[PDB]
Amino acid sequence: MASRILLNNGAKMPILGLGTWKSPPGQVTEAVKVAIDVGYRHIDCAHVYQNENEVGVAIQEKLREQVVKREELFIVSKLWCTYHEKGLVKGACQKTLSDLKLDYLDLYLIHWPTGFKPGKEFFPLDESGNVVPSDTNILDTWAAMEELVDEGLVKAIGISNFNHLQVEMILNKPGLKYKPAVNQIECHPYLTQEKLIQYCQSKGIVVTAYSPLGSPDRPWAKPEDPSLLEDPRIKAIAAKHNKTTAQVLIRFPMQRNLVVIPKSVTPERIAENFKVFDFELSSQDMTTLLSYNRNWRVCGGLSCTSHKDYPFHEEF
Ligand SMILES: NC(=O)c1ccc[n+]([C@@H]2O[C@H](COP(=O)([O-])OP(=O)(O)OC[C@H]3O[C@@H](n4cnc5c(N)ncnc54)[C@H](OP(=O)(O)O)[C@@H]3O)[C@@H](O)[C@H]2O)c1
Numbered sequence: 001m002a003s004r005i006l007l008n009n010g011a012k013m014p015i016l017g018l019g020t021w022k023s024p025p026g027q028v029t030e031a032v033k034v035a036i037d038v039g040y041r042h043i044d045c046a047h048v049y050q051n052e053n054e055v056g057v058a059i060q061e062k063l064r065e066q067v068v069k070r071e072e073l074f075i076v077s078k079l080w081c082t083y084h085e086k087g088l089v090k091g092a093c094q095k096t097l098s099d100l101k102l103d104y105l106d107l108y109l110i111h112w113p114t115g116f117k118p119g120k121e122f123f124p125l126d127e128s129g130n131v132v133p134s135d136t137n138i139l140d141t142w143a144a145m146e147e148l149v150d151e152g153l154v155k156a157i158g159i160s161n162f163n164h165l166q167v168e169m170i171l172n173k174p175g176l177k178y179k180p181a182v183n184q185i186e187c188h189p190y191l192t193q194e195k196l197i198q199y200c201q202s203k204g205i206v207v208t209a210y211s212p213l214g215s216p217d218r219p220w221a222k223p224e225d226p227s228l229l230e231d232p233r234i235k236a237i238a239a240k241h242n243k244t245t246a247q248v249l250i251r252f253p254m255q256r257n258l259v260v261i262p263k264s265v266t267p268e269r270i271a272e273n274f275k276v277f278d279f280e281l282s283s284q285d286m287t288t289l290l291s292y293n294r295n296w297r298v299c300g301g302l303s304c305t306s307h308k309d310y311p312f313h314e315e316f
């Protein structure tokens with residue numbers, strides 16, 4: 001299978017990337033160095049993850065060592081919710097660029113459709129515990145993202161955790177200058193996303209699947225939650241193909257024309273997770289994996305359910 005997918009800005013994006021949410025700052029530099037050494041060319045980042053400086057150390061070393069050229073890397077970051085105001089977007093992007101040791105991003109995403117009050121706190125709260133929203137809507141934030149393209153800071157812009165009506169709002173924006181290149185959403189066999197994926201693909205928007213392994217290290221995991229990596233039905237498909245369960249979970253979105261961004265800081269797993277271009281799931285395997293959908297979300301945003309732009313009230 002081909003290693004890159006063509007975006008609607010004319011650039012090619014590697015279909016496998018390394019995730020970095022929860023990667024400890026003291027381990028992520030080595031993780032990214034290992035990833036680049038074993039073939040990864042796409043790193044998924046975000047300011048809210050609090051480790052972009054350390055990710056950047058790895059990128060810069062591998063560029064200095066000439067393991068890769070900058071044009072061969074595809075670096076993604078995301079605008080956090082407290083920076084949706086038009087006057088804050090450029091500085092937020094520039095802080096990410098500074099931290100990552102880059103003079104452009106390949107892709108910059110609106111991390112969530114919900115804007116929050118600016119300030120030091122990433123989740124500003126009222127005295128009763130509700131997140132304090134911003135009054136800047138998604139269309140004005142989108143225009144600010146378009147400016148970043150026109151200033152050379154980013155090669156592509158996109159969105160993340162946008163439902164289909166929110167994607168449609170961007171596509172129908174008066175005076176839209178650049179369509180979103182990507183919508184990055186949670187997707188795995190327990191949250192298969194058929195409706196939202198087909199909508200985005202039908203509009204030429206590439207979908208990136210996050211938490212493809214079910215995020216076993218998510219900080220809010222409960223024992224009662226379903227576990228993809230331990231699901232005997234998925235293990236059986238992996239055994240049949242002589243691959244690991246993680247390798248099946250990574251190959252699955254690839255065969256749906258998605259980009260996928262598994263996270264690891266474990267060198268052996270970083271290498272394992274990349275060895276997914278040497279086998280094929282059958283159509284029956286794919287339909288079987290799709291059948292496991294239960295609309296289960298790692299990232300449910302349960303604390304933002306009253307925000308006017310909360311994405312997960314709508315069916316898709
Ligand atoms: N846009 C958004 O709102 C958003 C939200 C969530 C995630 N994301 C992005 O998507 C990335 C991936 O999602 P995620 O971090 O939630 O979780 P994930 O990639 O589904 O799972 C990561 C977990 O799986 C473990 N793991 C990795 N490879 C493994 C393997 N081969 N065998 C067994 N365990 C393995 C990792 O352990 P070790 O690290 O200890 O090896 C870690 O605990 C994030 O890091 C972030 O970049 C974006």
Ligand SMILES: O=C(O)COc1cc(F)ccc1C(=O)NCc1cccc(C(=O)O)c1
Pocket residue numbers: 021046048049081112113114299300301302304305307309310311
């Ligand atoms: O967001 C990610 O990439 C991974 O999760 C996180 C990572 C962090 F470093 C810090 C917080 C989160 C988090 O709570 N996300 C969920 C979230 C965030 C903002 C709004 C909504 C909403 O439902 O509107 C939902």
